[PDB]
C-alpha cells in the first residue's frame, strides 16, 4: 500500500509508474493518444519541478529507458499515419532535456541509449 505522494520523488515515482500502466501507447483517440500525451506533459512539469528545491531525484534514470528511449523508437511510424505528430517527438526530446538538467550526467545514458536504436 502507498499513501498520497508528498515528496517530489514520490510524485515522480507515481507518475512514472502510472505511465507504464498504459496498456497501449500512441493509439489515436489506435486510441487514447490524448491521455498518453498529457501524461508526458505531466512528467515534464514534474522533472522540471525537480530541482530538489525541496524534492527528490532518483527516478530519472528509470525514466530514460522506459519512457524516452522507447518512445522514439515507436515514433518512426509513417505507416498508413498513426495519429502521431511532430510535436510528439518534440515533447519527447523536451522530456529528455528535463532529465539532463536534473543533477545527472554519465555513461549510463550511453548504455541505455545504445541499447535501443536511438
From Swiss-Prot:
Domain of life: Eukaryota
Disulfide pattern: none
Subcellular location: Nucleus, Nuclear pore complex
Subunit structure: Part of the nuclear pore complex (NPC).
Entry's disease: Copy number variations of NUP188 gene may be a cause of heterotaxy, a congenital heart disease resulting from abnormalities in left-right (LR) body patterning.
Free-text function comment from the UniProt entry: Component of the nuclear pore complex (NPC), a complex required for the trafficking across the nuclear envelope. Required for proper protein transport into the nucleus.
Assigned protein family: Belongs to the Nup188 family.
Protein name, per record: Nucleoporin NUP188
Residues of the whole record sequence present: 1149 to 1312 of 1749
Amino acid at each position: 500500500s502507498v499513501n498520497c505522494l508528498r515528496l517530489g520523488s514520490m510524485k515522480c515515482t507515481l507518475l512514472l509508474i502510472l505511465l507504464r500502466q498504459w496498456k497501449r501507447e500512441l493509439g489515436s483517440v489506435q486510441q487514447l493518444m490524448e491521455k498518453t500525451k498529457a501524461k508526458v506533459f505531466s512528467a515534464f512539469i514534474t522533472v522540471l519541478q525537480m530541482k530538489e528545491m525541496k524534492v527528490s531525484d532518483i527516478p530519472q534514470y528509470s525514466q530514460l529507458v522506459l519512457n524516452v528511449c522507447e518512445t522514439l523508437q515507436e515514433e518512426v511510424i509513417a505507416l498508413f499515419h498513426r495519429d502521431q505528430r511532430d510535436g510528439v517527438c518534440v515533447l519527447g526530446l523536451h522530456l529528455a532535456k528535463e532529465l539532463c538538467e536534473v543533477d545527472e550526467d554519465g555513461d549510463s545514458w550511453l548504455q541505455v541509449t545504445r541499447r535501443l536504436p536511438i
